[PDB]
Symmetry: D4
Subunit: 203 residues, 8 copies
C-alpha cells in the first residue's frame, strides 16, 4: 500500500513516549511523519527526543522530516469565517502541506463583512480544491459553494455560543447548503478534509 | 382598542363555520385578516362572506378594503427561493393589510448571489427588511451584514432531510443576531410582518 | 459606512493586549468604543493601559469614552424575570446606553409574582422598544408581549436547572409566544438585542 | 376493587368490536369511561351499546349514569385557547365521571390576560386547578403563581413549527413546578383529571 | 397572602451574606424559614451568624426555627429507587417536614430487587401522598403508581450514566407511565414535589 | 450454508412481485420467513404462492412447514399490553419458525403487576425471555430483576405524545442492562427472536 | 456560463406546469436534468415535452441527449441494499448526465460482506467512489478504509425505528472521515454526483 | 437465590470504607467478589485493608478471591475497534473471567484496517458469545454480526470527538445493524454485557 502518503499518528490517545517509539520505527525515511491533535505540553515532553521536529502550536500538529517539494502544481485554498476557526484551519493547512500540496490561506472572510471574501475571490476561484472552515454561523460554505465551480469541502468547528450546540448547527447548515458542490466532514476534522482534498488535488 | 391594529383570525385550527361567526360578529373594525386559511376552507366560506378576498399563495383572507400606507417608507420582503414564496406572501399580505408599503425582492438566494446585489439598493432603501429562507437559511446572514436597518428573519419549513422542518434554517439565523438580525418562529410570516409594521410606523 | 454606531469589540476571543491595540487605533475620536464579553481578570490586565476606561462588572463590558447625550428622546425598557438574568440584562442595557439610547431598567418582575410586573407596567408601556430577558421559565415574554403594543425583543438566558437545557427551553418558549409582536435573538445575546433595539428606537 | 374508581378503557388502539367485548363483559361496575374514541368508531359502536353517550369534543364515551358529586368543592379546568378545548373536555368529562363538580374556565390565555383576571375568583375557589395550554404553555406559570391550591398542568400538541408536538409547552410548564405546579404528559387530559379527582376527594 | 406556608429562600443564587439579611428580616416569628440548594461551604460562611440554625447536609437545606407540630395527621411517603437518590429525596423530606407534614422515608426499594419495595408496601399505601424519586431507570414510579390509589408525584433525578442524559430519560419515563395517577415535576426538583405534596396532604 | 438458519425476507420495502421472485428462486431451503408483510401485499401474493401461511397480527408469512423444536427448553415472550401484541407475535412466529418452543405470556404490564406474578413460574422456567413493552418500557426492568436467564427487551412504537415513537421505552430498557437485560431496536421483534433462538439452541 | 455544467431543475416543490415553463425557456443549454420528479408529475408533463426521458427508479427526467464521457476514468456507485437503489440511481443518472462513465456496484452491504470483496477490483479502479447506505451506514467505513480514492458517502432515509429518517447513517458516516470519506445530506444522490463529477473530470 | 454468580459491588457511589464493610461481610467464602467502577485513588484508600485484593487499573475493577476454574469449556470473545475501547473492554473481560468464563481478547481490529479483523476471525468465530466494543464509528458490530452466527452483544463507548455525542452515535449505529443477531446494552456498560454473555456461555 504505497499510496505515497506520509505516515500519520493520531496523538490524542498516544502518550509522549508512545509517539517517540512509533516515530523512530518509521524513521526509515519512509516519508515525512505527521502527528495530529498533539497538546502543547505533550510536545514539551517529546522535544528532547526529536530535536529535528517542528511543532505547529495553533494546529497542534507535529511534523518530523521535510517533504521534498509539492507533488502537484495546483493548490488548495483554506477559507475561514473568523479567527476562532484558526486552530482547525491550521490543522487542515499543515496536513495538506505535509501531504505535498501547496496551500493558500484565506482567513477571516466571514459573511458579516463580505467584501473581505470578495477581495480574495480570485485566490479562492483559482484553487483546485477549497476547504471552508466555519463555526458560529457557518453560512460561508453556502456562499463559497455558490461562487466557485470547484470541489468544496466544509469543516464545521465547535467554537460555540448558546445554540451553536458545539458545532452541530454549523454541521447541519453545511449539509443543507442550497449551493451544490459542497461536501462535509465531522466537527473539527480539519485533518480529514485535507486528506480528502489532497487526494482530489493530486489526480 | 383603536390603536390602529386590524383584527386577526388564525384559521389553521378554526372551522369554516366558526370563521364566519367570528367575522360576522366583528363586522360591527375596519379590515379583518385571517391566516393559514386553506383553499378548500375559502370555497366553503365565499357564499357567506361576499366582500372577501382570498390570497391563494399566502393562504390569507381579507374582509374590508386594504388601507393606504400610513407611512412614506416601505418594508422589503426578501426571499431566498421560489419555495419560500408562500410564507413570503403571508408576510407581505399582512404588512400591506397593516398599512405598509411592501417591496418584494424574491428569489435571490446565495446559490446565485449576484441576483441579491442587483436588488441591493432596493433593500437598503427599506426601513425594515424581512428575510425569508429555508434549507440553510444563509440569506439572513448575508443581508444582515449588508444593511443598517432592522432585519427580521423568518425560517421556513421547506427543504429535505436534515432541514428538520426548518430547524437548521432557524438555528442558522439565530447564530447571526449580533449583526442586527432578529428571528421569529418557523413559517411565521405573520409574526414578522406584525413586528415589521410596528417598527415601520414609528 | 458612517452609521453613527460606536465601534464594538468582541473581547471573548481577543487578548488583553490585542484589545489595547484596537482601542488606541480607534482612539481617533471616531466615537465611543464598547467591548463585550470581557472577563474581570482580562480587564485587570488592561486597566493600567486605559486608565480612562469604565468596566461594567455584571455586564462584563468595557466602554472607553463617553457618548455625548442620548441621540433620541424615546427610551428602551430592559425587563428581566429574575436576578439570574442580571448579567445579560446589563450587557443589553450597557450596549443600548453606549449606542445613545436612554434605558429604563425593570428588573425582577417574573410571573411567579406578577404584581411586580403590573407595578412597573406604565414604565414598560411607555418605552419605544422593550427587551425581555428571561431564563428558567421565560414565559415573561409572552405576558409582556400580550400587554404592550410596541416591539418586543426577547433574549433567552442560559441560567438553567435540569430540563432548562442551557437556555434552549427559554428560546423555544419565546419563539412560540401566543402573543404576537415578539422577536427573538440567540441565547445570552444581550448585545444583539440592544443593537436591534437601538436601530428601532432611533428612527 | 370497590375503591370508588370507575373502569377506564383506552380506545385509541382498541378496535370497535374489542371495545364492545370489554364493555359487554364489564356490564356485570357502575360507570365505564372510554377515552380517545374516534367519531367513526362510535358510529360503529352505537347500535350495539344503546345506553352509551358520546362526547364529541372530548372524544370520550360513557356507559352508565354519571354520579353526583361526592364532594362539595369543585375542580376548575382552565384553558389557554379554543384549540386546547378537546383535551380540556377530555379532562372535564373524566372529572365529572369520577364524581367531581367541574368548573370550565376557557379561552383565557396570556395573549389577552385580562380575561384570566375576570375569572380569577372562580379559579381561586377551586380545590384543584387543571391548566391546559399549548404553544408556549405560559398559562400554567401565571396560574401557579396566583393560586395556593394544587395545579396540574397539561401540555397540548396543538401548535405549529417549533411547538414540537407539544414539547415546548411541556418543558415550559416543567420549568415552573416550584410554584405549586405538577405536570402530566402531552394531551393527557385523562391523567390530569385522574389525579385531580384523587386530590379533590380527600 | 397568609397561606400558612413557611418562608422559602432559594440559596442557589443568593450569597451567604445576602441570605442572612433576609433571615433576620423574616425573624419576626412569621413562621420557620427554609433555605434550599445551600452549599456546605456557604453554610459554613453563615453559621457564626445564625447559631440556632440547622443544616441538612445531604438535602443541602437549612431551617431556622422549629415548626410547632405537624399541621395534619396524615403523612407523606418519600420513596427512592437507589442511594444516589438520597440528596433530592432528603430535600423533599426536609421541605415537607418544614411545611408541617409527617414524612415516612422509604429508601432503596428500586425494582432491581422488588421484594424490598413489597416489604414496605403497607407504609407506602398508608400515605396520603407519595413522592417517588428515581434516576438511572426511574421505572419505580410506574410500579408504585400501579400499586397505590393515592396521588403520586414523581421526581426525576440527574444521577446519570451514559444514555441517562442527566435525568432526561427518567423524566420521559415518568411522563409516559402506563399506571395512571402519577404527576411529574422537573429534574431534581424535590422541593417542588414536597410543596405540591404538602398542599395535597393538608386539605 | 446448512447452519440451520432459515432464509429471511424483509418485505417492508420489497414489492409483492419481487417477493414472489425471491421466494420462487429460493424454493430450490426448507422454511422461508417474510417479515413486515402488509395484509394487502399478501392478498396480491396468495394466488402465486399457494403453500404459504399468513400470520395476520404478526404481519409475517411462512412458506414451508414449521419444524419441530430442536431443543427441549422453551422461549417465553412476555408483553406489557394488548397493543404490544403485533410485534410480540412477530417475535413468536420467528422463534417458532427457527425451531423453538414459544410460551406466550401476554398483557402483564406493571399497571397491574399481580398478573405478572401469576405467570412468574412460566417465565422463570424459560431458557430465554423476550420482553415486549411500549410507553414507559418499565416491564423489562421488573422481569430482568426477577429471573436469572438472558432477557432480550424489545421497545415498541405504540404510545402517545412523549413516547417519541418508542424512544422512551428504548432508553428506559437501556438503563437496566446491568440486571441481565439486553436490548434490540424499536419494534424489532424479529431481531430479538433471532438472538433468542441462537441462545436457546446451545 | 459555458463551464460544462448542464442546467438542473429541482422538481420536488415545482409544479408540473412550472417545470415546462423552465424547460421551454431553457431550450434556447445542451442537456437539462430534473430531480425528485414524481411519476405522476411526468405523466402530466410528457405530452408537452416529447423529447424527454424519465428514469423511474431515479425519479429523474432528462431532456436532450446524454453526452459521451469526457474523461477515460469512471465513477463507481456502491450501494448497501436494494432499498438504497432509488437514490443510487439518482446519483448514477446525474453522473452520466454530467458526462462521466458510471459503474454500478449494487447490494453489497456488510450483512454479507463477501459480496463487496467480489467487486473490490471494480471499486478500486474508480477515480471516485460514491457509497450509498441506510440503516447503520456502516458500508461507507468499510469502503473508505479499502480504497485510496476520494469517497463521497450518501446516507439514505430508508430504515425503521431509530434510523431517524437517515440520521443514524449520516452520523455513522460522519464518524469516519479521517479515512478519506466525505459526506452529503440525507438522500442527496444529486449532490454527491455533482461533487464526484467535478473530482472525476480533473 | 444461589445462581452461582459472584457478588458484585458497584463502587461508583460507595466510599472506600463502605466497600470494605461489604467485602468483609461477604468474606464468608460465598464466592469471589467483583467491584466495578472503582477509581484508582479509591483503591489506594482500600488496599491496606484488603492486601489479598487485585486491582485492574484499565478496567477500574477490583476482585478479592480467585474463582477456582472456568465453569464451562466455551469462551467469550471481547472484540474492540480501537485502543480507546480498552477500559470498558477490560471491564467486560474482567467481569466475564470473574464469573467463571474463559475470555479471548481480540483488540484493535476496527474497520479502518479490516485485515486485522480477518486475521483474528477464526478466534472470533470459535467463541460461544462475542462482545463487540466500539466508539467513534462503532460500525464494527455490524461487520462482526454479519460474519458470525453466534450471539453478539454490542457495547457502545463514550470515547467521542465532535458528533460522537458521548457514545450516542455508536449506540444508534449498533441498534440499527443491518446484520441480525446483535443485541445491545447501554453506553460504557461493559459489566452488563459480560453479565449477559456469561449467562449465555454457561447453559
Ligand atoms: Mg447591520
Ligand atoms: Mg402557589
Ligand atoms: Mg438477573
Ligand atoms: Mg483511504
Ligand atoms: Zn440559501
Ligand atoms: Zn399562551
Ligand atoms: Zn409499562
Ligand atoms: Zn449496512
Amino acid at each position: 500500500r504505497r499510496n505515497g502518503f506520509p505516515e500519520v499518528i493520531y496523538g490524542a490517545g498516544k502518550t509522549a513516549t508512545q509517539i517517540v517509539g512509533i516515530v523512530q520505527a518509521l524513521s526509515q525515511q519512509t516519508l515525512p511523519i505527521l502527528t495530529t491533535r498533539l497538546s502543547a505540553e505533550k510536545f514539551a515532553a517529546l522535544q528532547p527526543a526529536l530535536p529535528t521536529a517542528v511543532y505547529h502550536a495553533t494546529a497542534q500538529c507535529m511534523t518530523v522530516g521535510e517533504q521534498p517539494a509539492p507533488k502537484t502544481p495546483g493548490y488548495i485554498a483554506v477559507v475561514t469565517a473568523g479567527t476562532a476557526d484558526q486552530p482547525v484551519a491550521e490543522e487542515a493547512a499543515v496536513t495538506a502541506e505535509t501531504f505535498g500540496n501547496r496551500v493558500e490561506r484565506v482567513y477571516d472572510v466571514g459573511v458579516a463583512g463580505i467584501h473581505r471574501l470578495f477581495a480574495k475571490l480570485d485566490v479562492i476561484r483559482g484553487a483546485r480544491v477549497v476547504i471552508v472552515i466555519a463555526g458560529m454561523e457557518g453560512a460561508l460554505a453556502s456562499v463559497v459553494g455558490g461562487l466557485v465551480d470547484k470541489p468544496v469541502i466544509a469543516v464545521p468547528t465547535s467554537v460555540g455560543y448558546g445554540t451553536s450546540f458545539q458545532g452541530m448547527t454549523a454541521l447541519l447548515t453545511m449539509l443543507n447548503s442550497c449551493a451544490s458542490g459542497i461536501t462535509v466532514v465531522n466537527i473539527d476534522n480539519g485533518f480529514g478534509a485535507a486528506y480528502s482534498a489532497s487526494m482530489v488535488n493530486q489526480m
